[PDB]
Design a protein around this ligand. Structure first.
Ligand SMILES: Cc1cc2nc3c(=O)[nH]c(=O)nc-3n(C[C@H](O)[C@H](O)[C@H](O)COP(=O)(O)OP(=O)(O)OC[C@H]3O[C@@H](n4cnc5c(N)ncnc54)[C@H](O)[C@@H]3O)c2cc1C
Ligand SMILES: O=C(O)CCn1c(=O)oc2cc(OC3CC3)c(Cl)cc21
Ligand SMILES: O=C(O)CCn1c(=O)oc2cc(OC3CC3)c(Cl)cc21
Ligand SMILES: O=C(O)CCn1c(=O)oc2cc(OC3CC3)c(Cl)cc21
Ligand SMILES: [Cl-]
Length: 448
């Protein structure tokens, strides 16, 4: 039986562990944190993620989709909140088959851990990877107390997240050709209780957005009608705009309250614990990290956040990581040898990871910001109605299909250009020759 050591029992790590273990691989998974399935008296906080077709399909292949979806809230559309207009629901798709699912990350991770163990993988918690000796094929792990443990390895999978220790160890034997693009927005998680969301009639079956240009809030629902609100705001005010809001200007929870009362007045009354959440929850950091190299011969490979940290503005990081896990298990299972598997996996996934990284950055302006754009959306709807197998909005291709991200991006760009061109020099849709735009659609977009 082929052997594999996986670092990180997160989303990608535990999925790849199940896929490989059920194919008869001897799987050992090392995780720095304690086992979250071991109930303690610690007061844990709920963070939700948007699960879309890519992630759901990866879970479906693993035989875990039903179990995960039983614990997920359906999000039928986007609810945009702008003061002075009632909340506007933008349905995500044609019907309830085109939805996104809000899932608690901890619940998802527990289901995944059970799945990897049921398949035969062994999971070792409270052991963080410290270093790797590639030449000797040994690695060093330690608990929180710094007590060390050395292990021999045959194949090493770095599923250890955005601050990957495997990636850091690889960067000592190979030049990974890493390019870090820092992101100016920090984030803070705030809570809306079930009583508050019910009192203010906040729709449970939708993804909620409070756009505000350079900053914004998003809320995802929980099974119990509570919501996790995420504020995206610059860490610091720029040199050009010193008065512009930033985390540096919000000295404490009381400053955060005044800021919400002024900038998010319809949201502030729903945030009962705003002050407390602001001071006790740390401000998170965002970034995009692109690597030229994801593997060291047949010895080690990266996937998920370890390979391609991305900004969260498209809610695709977990979706992409689960898609990566399927691809990596498929390549490893069927390749001539591990070195061939790792090279084929990297060649396949690298263009798609770059595409979602670019699309995630672009989605921010789409969410947080129109005149000509409403005419573009109107024309886009008609083109999707006339040619549903050719004109598929980029958001739908990314969220509701398994089309390679690079293909969704390339087709999205053709669509964006046709719409921009068609509406230019036109006041309304009546002056636009719909058949001529349709002719460009049939000419430039092959049916799917
Ligand atoms: C604010 C925010 C919102 C997001 N929202 C969404 C969303 O709506 N939808 C979506 O698709 N994605 C979303 N994402 C992205 C998503 O959370 C990640 O892309 C995803 O968790 C990556 O999965 P992973 O398995 O690669 O890494 P992780 O889930 O981070 O798992 C890494 C694991 O490795 C462990 N580990 C780390 N270092 C070591 C070490 N040295 N030794 C051993 N173990 C170690 C960690 O403890 C952890 O268990 C969001 C991200 C952020 C920051
Ligand atoms: O911010 C937080 O409270 C932690 C979020 N989180 C994370 O970054 O990696 C995780 C890994 C987890 O379980 C796997 C088995 C270790 C869980 Cl249950 C949660 C997380
Ligand atoms: O364009 C849209 O209508 C929404 C895009 N999107 C998504 O599908 O899941 C998400 C999760 C997000 O962050 C998590 C909640 C903290 C963000 Cl910031 C954006 C998305
Ligand atoms: O509305 C009309 O009467 C103009 C029709 N029209 C045209 O003659 O050439 C086009 C080319 C177009 O896009 C491709 C990217 C150049 C579009 Cl979107 C529209 C047209
Ligand atoms: Cl994301």
């Amino acid at each position: 039986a082929r052997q594999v050591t996986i670092i990180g029992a997160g989303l990608a790590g535990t999925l790849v562990a199940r896929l490989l273990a059920r194919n008869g691989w001897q799987v050992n998974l090392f995780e720095r944190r304690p086992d979250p399935r071991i109930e303690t008296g610690a007061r844990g906080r709920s963070i939700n993620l948007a699960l879309a077709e890519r992630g759901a399909h990866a879970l479906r292949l693993a035989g875990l989709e039903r179990e995960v979806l039983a614990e997920a809230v359906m999000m039928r559309g986007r609810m945009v909140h702008v003061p002075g207009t009632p909340p506007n629901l933008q349905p995500y798709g044609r019907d309830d088959s085109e939805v996104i699912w809000s899932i608690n990350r901890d619940r998802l991770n527990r289901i995944l851990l059970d799945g990897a163990e049921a398949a035969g993988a062994s999971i070792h918690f409270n052991l963080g990877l410290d270093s790797v000796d590639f030449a000797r094929q040994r690695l060093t792990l330690s608990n929180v107390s710094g007590e060390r443990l050395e292990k021999r390895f045959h194949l090493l999978i770095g599923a250890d997240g955005c601050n990957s220790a495997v990636r850091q160890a690889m960067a000592s034997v190979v030049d990974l050709g890493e390019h870090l693009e820092t992101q100016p927005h920090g984030y803070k998680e705030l809570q809306i209780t079930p009583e508050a969301s019910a009192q203010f009639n906040l729709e449970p079956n939708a993804l909620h957005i409070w756009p505000h240009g350079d900053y914004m809030c998003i809320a995802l629902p929980n099974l119990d009608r509570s919501f996790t609100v995420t504020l995206f705001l610059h860490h610091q005010s720029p040199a050009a705009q010193p008065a512009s809001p930033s985390f540096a200007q919000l000295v404490d929870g009381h400053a955060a309250r005044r800021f919400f009362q002024r900038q998010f007045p319809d949201l502030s009354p729903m945030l009962d614990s705003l002050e407390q959440d602001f001071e006790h929850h740390p401000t998170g950091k965002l970034a995009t990290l692109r690597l030229t190299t994801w593997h060291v011969g047949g010895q080690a490979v990266l996937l998920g956040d370890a390979a391609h940290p991305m900004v969260p503005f498209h809610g695709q990081g977990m979706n992409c990581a689960l898609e990566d896990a399927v691809a990596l298990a498929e390549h490893l299972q069927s390749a001539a040898d591990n070195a061939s598997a790792l090279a084929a996996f990297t060649a396949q996934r690298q263009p798609d990871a770059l595409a979602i990284q670019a699309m995630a950055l672009e989605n921010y302006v789409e969410m947080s910001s129109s005149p000509t754009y409403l005419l573009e959306r109107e024309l886009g709807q008609i083109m999707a109605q006339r040619q549903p197998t050719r004109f598929i909005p980029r958001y739908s291709m990314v969220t509701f299909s398994r089309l390679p991200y690079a293909q969704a991006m390339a087709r999205g760009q053709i669509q964006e250009q046709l719409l921009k061109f068609a509406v230019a020099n036109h006041s309304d849709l009546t002056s636009i020759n719909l058949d001529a735009v349709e002719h460009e659609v049939t000419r430039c977009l092959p049916p799917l």
